[PDB]
Amino acid sequence: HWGYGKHNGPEHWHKDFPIAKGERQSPVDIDTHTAKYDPSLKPLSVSYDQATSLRILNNGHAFNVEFDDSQDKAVLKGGPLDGTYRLIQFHFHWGSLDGQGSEHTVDKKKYAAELHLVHWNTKYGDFGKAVQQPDGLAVLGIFLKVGSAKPGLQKVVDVLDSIKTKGKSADFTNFDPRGLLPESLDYWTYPGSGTTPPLLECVTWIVLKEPISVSSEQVLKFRKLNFNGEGEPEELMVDNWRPAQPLKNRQIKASFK
Numbered sequence: 001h002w003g004y005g006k007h008n009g010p011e012h013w014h015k016d017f018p019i020a021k022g023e024r025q026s027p028v029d030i031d032t033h034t035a036k037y038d039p040s041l042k043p044l045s046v047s048y049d050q051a052t053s054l055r056i057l058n059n060g061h062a063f064n065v066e067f068d069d070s071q072d073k074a075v076l077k078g079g080p081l082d083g084t085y086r087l088i089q090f091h092f093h094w095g096s097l098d099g100q101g102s103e104h105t106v107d108k109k110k111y112a113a114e115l116h117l118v119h120w121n122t123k124y125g126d127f128g129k130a131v132q133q134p135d136g137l138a139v140l141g142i143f144l145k146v147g148s149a150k151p152g153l154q155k156v157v158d159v160l161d162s163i164k165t166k167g168k169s170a171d172f173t174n175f176d177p178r179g180l181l182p183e184s185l186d187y188w189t190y191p192g193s194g195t196t197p198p199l200l201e202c203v204t205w206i207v208l209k210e211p212i213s214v215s216s217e218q219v220l221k222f223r224k225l226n227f228n229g230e231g232e233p234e235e236l237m238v239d240n241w242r243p244a245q246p247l248k249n250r251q252i253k254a255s256f257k
């Protein structure tokens, strides 16, 4: 089955998921000079005050912090979006070394990691119906650089010992994802896809310009997780990023001058 190794990595995905070579795949390189300011974009509205986290799960490719999405509680709207998108989960992608790990790149620069806050369009009733639609998802992408610690990340780092291997979960209530956001909500946006199989082309990407800083100790702890299940040979969960894909017939728009 798919993964991030030599034999089952991103270059192989297209055999089981032909949409891998589709017209609006993600991630992409953001060429900052070629991304045009769009003064018709709105400010992003991130309303996470009532977000209810439930659980954290190692799914064998990342860890997901899952939210209760059965009511309108943690929503994204505005910016490029029409309508209301509900947060369902966040996760990260990261590297084996600080010099790589992000999925999106900025003028070919790779950040140490990238956070994805996944939201589904509430006009489609739930996540599963939303991923049958070209405007089903909105993903807020936030870059991580290594420097100062992010205090709001620490509750996540500290629970990872308890979900080391694939299939493990832990209760993870009362986690406030506002503590993962940078100061500025300036963003780039484009139409694209999920970045893991099944790579569905549902996503309005909203990629914040400002990274967050995390400490070397915080990212080191991500790197102790395992792709494998308990009792299987240990394979460190590192380099769980898909490289930049061809832009094709798309324009990346900037919310800022």
Ligand SMILES: O=c1cccccc1O
Binding pocket: 116, 118, 137, 139, 193, 194, 195, 196
């Ligand atoms: O960020 C993601 C969002 C939606 C679907 C699939 C995979 C991802 O990494």
Ligand SMILES: [Zn+2]
Binding pocket: 091, 092, 093, 116, 195
């Ligand atoms: Zn992701």
